[PDB]
Amino acid sequence: MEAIPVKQFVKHIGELYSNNQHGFSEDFEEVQRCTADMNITAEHSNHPENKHKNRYINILAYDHSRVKLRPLPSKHSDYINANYVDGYNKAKAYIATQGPLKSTFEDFWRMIWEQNTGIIVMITNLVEKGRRKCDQYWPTENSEEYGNIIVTLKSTKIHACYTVRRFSIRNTKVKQNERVVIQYHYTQWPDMGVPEYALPVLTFVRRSSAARMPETGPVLVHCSAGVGRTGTYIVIDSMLQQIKDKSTVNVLGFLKHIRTQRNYLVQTEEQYIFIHDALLEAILGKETE
Ligand SMILES: O=C(O)c1ccccc1SCc1ccc(Cl)c(Cl)c1
């Protein structure tokens, strides 16, 4: 299980697809098993005081990697369902977290402030197929207040497949001190089935990733549970970095690694395949533009 040279990778993808994606299934089953001999504690996620702070009862934040909120003058005011996740050759390049609940909006923005996060990647619509996926944690227009954090919508650009909102946030208890936070929001989600083409996602990963500023906190990435699409984004982005750096790809190895940092990152085989399609589009896209 070593890195694959980028020039062999698309051929590798052919092989994984063949015979009704038998190879993909092997890979992903291996991913899902890669935790079998690992007990990873999530005591805080399971504490009675924090239960209401978890969007899904089965989706937890591993203790060792969990993002800690600075405590408040409550023993469990430190908790949010969120984990640091490695990027390519970079520890804690991301915070992967659930779509925030109304009840955790203040925690959410406090984390962004405390972690010096400058970019949000939102990979879900608030509602999908009639179902509630995420609560709106930003102002529709002008300003909204969440605890000591006041968020102001400055500008929006609505593209075909995603939306960029530029906020300025201010901490009232500081002096206030103001930061730019940009939210990249992928908006194109089919009423039936799942997204079919990787190219628009590739473009979205490229632009939202290039927006990262030195030297800032980790990029915040969420969907609904903050594992499936969230994991998918992180692997694609990271592998694009590896390709740029070393002209090699290691999807299976990298994914098994980050699976120790938040449960279920890249949740389905179809997402796993999608990662490969995006990288394929990046590889084939070069040398032929
Ligand atoms: O949405 C899913 O669960 C799904 C199921 C099968 C195949 C692909 C997907 S999600 C595809 C996707 C869309 C937007 C972004 Cl930004 C990223 Cl990173 C990945």
Coordinates of C-alpha atoms and ligand atoms in Angstrom, one line a residue:
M1 CA 0.0 0.0 0.0
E2 CA 2.4 2.6 -1.3
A3 CA 1.9 5.8 -3.3
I4 CA 0.8 5.3 -6.9
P5 CA 2.6 7.4 -9.5
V6 CA 0.1 9.9 -11.0
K7 CA 0.7 8.6 -14.5
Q8 CA -0.5 5.1 -13.5
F9 CA -3.5 6.3 -11.4
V10 CA -6.1 6.6 -14.1
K11 CA -5.2 3.1 -15.3
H12 CA -5.6 2.0 -11.7
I13 CA -9.1 3.6 -11.6
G14 CA -10.0 1.5 -14.7
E15 CA -9.0 -1.6 -12.8
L16 CA -11.0 -0.6 -9.7
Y17 CA -14.1 0.1 -11.8
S18 CA -13.9 -3.2 -13.7
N19 CA -16.2 -6.1 -13.0
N20 CA -18.8 -4.0 -11.4
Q21 CA -16.5 -2.1 -9.2
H22 CA -15.2 -5.1 -7.3
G23 CA -11.9 -3.4 -6.7
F24 CA -13.5 -0.3 -5.3
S25 CA -15.5 -2.5 -3.0
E26 CA -12.4 -4.3 -1.7
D27 CA -10.7 -1.0 -1.0
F28 CA -13.6 0.5 0.8
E29 CA -14.3 -2.7 2.9
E30 CA -10.7 -2.5 3.9
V31 CA -11.2 1.2 4.9
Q32 CA -14.3 0.2 7.0
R33 CA -12.3 -2.6 8.6
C34 CA -9.1 -0.5 9.2
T35 CA -10.5 0.3 12.6
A36 CA -11.5 -3.2 13.7
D37 CA -8.5 -3.6 16.1
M38 CA -8.8 0.0 17.3
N39 CA -10.7 1.2 20.3
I40 CA -10.9 5.0 20.0
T41 CA -12.5 6.8 22.9
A42 CA -15.2 9.5 22.6
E43 CA -16.2 10.0 26.2
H44 CA -17.1 13.7 25.9
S45 CA -19.4 13.1 22.9
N46 CA -21.3 10.5 25.0
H47 CA -21.6 12.6 28.2
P48 CA -25.3 13.3 29.1
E49 CA -24.5 17.1 29.1
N50 CA -23.3 17.0 25.5
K51 CA -25.9 14.8 24.0
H52 CA -28.1 17.7 22.8
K53 CA -25.0 19.1 21.1
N54 CA -24.7 16.1 18.7
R55 CA -26.8 16.3 15.5
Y56 CA -26.8 12.5 15.3
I57 CA -26.5 10.1 18.2
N58 CA -24.2 7.7 16.2
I59 CA -21.9 10.4 14.9
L60 CA -19.3 11.3 17.5
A61 CA -16.1 13.3 18.0
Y62 CA -13.0 11.2 18.9
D63 CA -11.5 12.5 22.2
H64 CA -7.9 12.7 21.1
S65 CA -8.6 14.8 18.1
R66 CA -11.7 16.7 19.2
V67 CA -11.7 20.5 19.0
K68 CA -11.9 22.0 22.5
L69 CA -13.7 25.2 23.2
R70 CA -12.1 27.4 25.8
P71 CA -14.1 26.7 28.9
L72 CA -16.7 29.1 30.3
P73 CA -17.2 30.5 33.9
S74 CA -19.8 24.5 33.0
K75 CA -17.4 21.6 32.9
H76 CA -18.7 20.6 29.5
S77 CA -18.8 24.1 27.9
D78 CA -15.6 22.9 26.1
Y79 CA -17.4 20.5 23.8
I80 CA -18.4 20.7 20.2
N81 CA -18.8 17.8 17.8
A82 CA -15.7 18.5 15.7
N83 CA -12.3 17.0 15.1
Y84 CA -9.0 18.2 13.8
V85 CA -8.0 16.3 10.7
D86 CA -4.7 16.1 8.9
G87 CA -4.2 17.4 5.4
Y88 CA -1.3 16.5 3.1
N89 CA 1.9 16.8 5.0
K90 CA 0.2 19.1 7.4
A91 CA -1.2 18.3 10.9
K92 CA -4.7 19.7 11.8
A93 CA -5.2 21.2 8.4
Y94 CA -8.9 20.9 8.8
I95 CA -11.6 21.0 11.3
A96 CA -14.3 18.5 10.2
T97 CA -17.6 19.1 12.0
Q98 CA -21.3 18.6 11.8
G99 CA -23.7 21.2 10.4
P100 CA -24.4 23.2 13.5
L101 CA -27.6 23.2 15.4
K102 CA -29.4 26.3 16.6
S103 CA -28.4 25.2 20.1
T104 CA -24.7 25.1 19.1
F105 CA -24.5 28.2 16.9
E106 CA -22.6 30.1 19.6
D107 CA -20.1 27.3 20.1
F108 CA -19.7 27.0 16.3
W109 CA -18.7 30.7 15.9
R110 CA -16.7 30.7 19.1
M111 CA -14.6 27.8 17.7
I112 CA -14.1 29.7 14.4
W113 CA -12.9 32.7 16.4
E114 CA -10.7 30.8 18.9
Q115 CA -9.2 28.6 16.1
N116 CA -8.5 31.6 13.8
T117 CA -10.5 29.8 11.1
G118 CA -10.8 32.0 7.9
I119 CA -12.5 29.6 5.6
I120 CA -15.7 27.6 5.9
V121 CA -16.5 24.8 3.4
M122 CA -20.2 23.9 3.5
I123 CA -21.1 20.8 1.6
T124 CA -24.8 20.4 2.0
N125 CA -28.0 22.4 1.5
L126 CA -30.0 23.4 4.6
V127 CA -32.7 21.1 3.3
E128 CA -32.3 18.2 0.9
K129 CA -35.1 16.0 -0.5
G130 CA -37.6 17.5 2.0
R131 CA -35.3 16.7 4.9
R132 CA -33.5 19.0 7.4
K133 CA -29.7 18.7 7.0
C134 CA -28.4 21.9 8.5
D135 CA -29.6 25.0 10.4
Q136 CA -28.7 28.4 8.9
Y137 CA -25.8 29.6 11.1
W138 CA -25.2 32.8 9.2
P139 CA -27.3 36.0 8.6
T140 CA -29.5 36.1 5.5
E141 CA -28.6 39.8 5.3
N142 CA -26.7 42.4 7.3
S143 CA -25.7 41.2 10.8
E144 CA -26.6 38.5 13.4
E145 CA -25.2 37.9 16.8
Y146 CA -24.1 34.6 18.3
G147 CA -22.8 35.0 21.8
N148 CA -19.8 37.4 21.7
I149 CA -19.5 36.9 17.9
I150 CA -21.3 39.3 15.5
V151 CA -21.3 38.1 11.9
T152 CA -21.9 40.5 9.0
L153 CA -22.6 39.3 5.5
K154 CA -20.6 41.6 3.2
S155 CA -21.1 40.1 -0.2
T156 CA -22.3 37.0 -2.1
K157 CA -21.6 35.4 -5.4
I158 CA -23.9 32.7 -6.5
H159 CA -22.4 30.4 -9.1
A160 CA -24.1 27.6 -11.0
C161 CA -23.0 24.9 -8.5
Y162 CA -21.9 26.8 -5.4
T163 CA -22.1 30.1 -3.5
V164 CA -19.4 32.2 -2.0
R165 CA -20.4 34.4 1.0
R166 CA -17.9 36.9 2.4
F167 CA -18.5 37.6 6.1
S168 CA -16.8 40.0 8.5
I169 CA -17.0 38.7 12.1
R170 CA -16.3 40.7 15.2
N171 CA -15.7 39.6 18.8
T172 CA -17.5 42.0 21.2
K173 CA -15.3 41.0 24.2
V174 CA -12.2 42.1 22.3
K175 CA -10.7 45.5 21.5
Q176 CA -13.7 45.3 18.3
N177 CA -11.3 42.9 16.7
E178 CA -12.5 41.9 13.2
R179 CA -11.7 39.1 10.8
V180 CA -12.7 38.1 7.3
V181 CA -14.4 34.7 7.0
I182 CA -15.3 33.3 3.6
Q183 CA -17.8 30.5 3.2
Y184 CA -17.7 28.2 0.2
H185 CA -21.1 26.6 -0.1
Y186 CA -21.7 23.8 -2.6
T187 CA -25.4 24.1 -3.5
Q188 CA -26.0 21.7 -6.4
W189 CA -27.7 18.7 -4.9
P190 CA -30.0 16.4 -7.0
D191 CA -33.6 15.9 -5.9
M192 CA -33.1 12.2 -6.9
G193 CA -30.1 10.1 -6.3
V194 CA -26.6 11.6 -6.0
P195 CA -24.3 14.0 -7.9
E196 CA -23.1 12.5 -11.2
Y197 CA -20.2 14.7 -12.5
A198 CA -16.9 15.4 -10.6
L199 CA -15.7 18.3 -12.7
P200 CA -17.8 21.0 -11.0
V201 CA -16.8 19.6 -7.6
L202 CA -13.1 19.7 -8.7
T203 CA -13.5 23.3 -9.6
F204 CA -15.1 23.9 -6.2
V205 CA -12.3 22.1 -4.3
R206 CA -9.7 24.1 -6.2
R207 CA -11.2 27.5 -5.6
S208 CA -12.1 27.0 -1.9
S209 CA -8.7 25.4 -1.2
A210 CA -6.7 28.2 -2.9
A211 CA -8.6 30.7 -0.8
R212 CA -6.8 29.3 2.3
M213 CA -4.6 32.1 3.8
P214 CA -1.2 31.8 5.4
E215 CA -0.9 31.5 8.2
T216 CA -4.4 30.9 9.5
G217 CA -6.3 28.4 11.5
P218 CA -7.6 25.1 10.0
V219 CA -10.2 25.2 7.2
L220 CA -13.6 24.3 8.7
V221 CA -15.4 21.7 6.6
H222 CA -18.9 20.5 7.3
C223 CA -21.9 18.8 5.7
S224 CA -24.8 17.5 7.8
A225 CA -23.1 14.8 10.0
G226 CA -19.7 16.1 9.0
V227 CA -18.2 12.8 7.9
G228 CA -19.3 11.6 4.5
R229 CA -19.0 14.6 2.1
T230 CA -16.7 16.2 4.6
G231 CA -14.3 13.3 4.4
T232 CA -14.6 13.3 0.6
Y233 CA -13.6 16.9 0.3
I234 CA -10.6 16.4 2.6
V235 CA -9.2 13.5 0.6
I236 CA -9.7 15.1 -2.7
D237 CA -8.1 18.4 -1.6
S238 CA -5.2 16.5 0.1
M239 CA -4.5 14.2 -2.8
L240 CA -4.5 17.2 -5.2
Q241 CA -1.8 18.6 -2.9
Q242 CA 0.2 15.3 -3.0
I243 CA -0.1 15.2 -6.8
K244 CA 1.2 18.8 -7.0
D245 CA 4.0 18.0 -4.6
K246 CA 5.2 14.5 -5.6
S247 CA 3.2 13.5 -8.6
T248 CA 1.9 10.5 -6.7
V249 CA -1.5 9.5 -5.2
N250 CA -2.4 7.6 -2.0
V251 CA -6.2 7.7 -1.5
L252 CA -6.5 4.4 0.4
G253 CA -3.5 5.1 2.7
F254 CA -4.5 8.7 3.5
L255 CA -8.1 7.8 4.1
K256 CA -7.3 4.9 6.5
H257 CA -5.2 7.5 8.4
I258 CA -7.8 10.2 8.8
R259 CA -10.4 7.6 9.7
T260 CA -8.6 7.5 13.1
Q261 CA -9.2 11.2 13.5
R262 CA -13.0 11.4 12.9
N263 CA -15.4 8.4 12.6
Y264 CA -16.7 7.4 9.2
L265 CA -14.9 10.1 7.1
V266 CA -15.9 9.2 3.6
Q267 CA -19.0 7.2 4.6
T268 CA -19.9 5.3 1.4
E269 CA -18.3 3.4 -1.4
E270 CA -19.9 5.8 -3.9
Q271 CA -18.2 8.7 -2.2
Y272 CA -15.0 6.7 -2.3
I273 CA -15.4 6.2 -6.0
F274 CA -16.3 9.9 -6.4
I275 CA -12.9 10.9 -4.9
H276 CA -11.3 8.9 -7.7
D277 CA -13.4 10.5 -10.4
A278 CA -12.5 14.0 -9.2
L279 CA -8.8 13.1 -9.2
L280 CA -9.1 11.5 -12.6
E281 CA -10.6 14.7 -13.9
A282 CA -7.7 16.7 -12.4
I283 CA -5.1 14.4 -14.0
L284 CA -6.8 14.2 -17.4
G285 CA -7.5 17.9 -17.2
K286 CA -3.8 18.7 -17.2
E287 CA -1.7 18.2 -20.3
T288 CA -5.0 18.6 -22.2
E289 CA -6.5 22.0 -21.5
Ligands
LIG1 O1 -23.5 13.3 -1.5 C1 -23.1 12.1 -1.4 O2 -23.2 11.4 -0.4 C2 -22.5 11.5 -2.6 C3 -22.9 10.1 -2.9 C4 -22.3 9.6 -4.1 C5 -21.3 10.3 -4.9 C6 -20.9 11.6 -4.5 C7 -21.5 12.2 -3.3 S1 -21.1 13.8 -2.8 C8 -20.1 14.5 -4.1 C9 -19.5 15.8 -3.7 C10 -20.3 17.0 -4.0 C11 -19.8 18.3 -3.6 C12 -18.5 18.3 -2.9 CL1 -17.8 19.8 -2.5 C13 -17.8 17.1 -2.6 CL2 -16.2 17.2 -1.8 C14 -18.3 15.8 -3.0

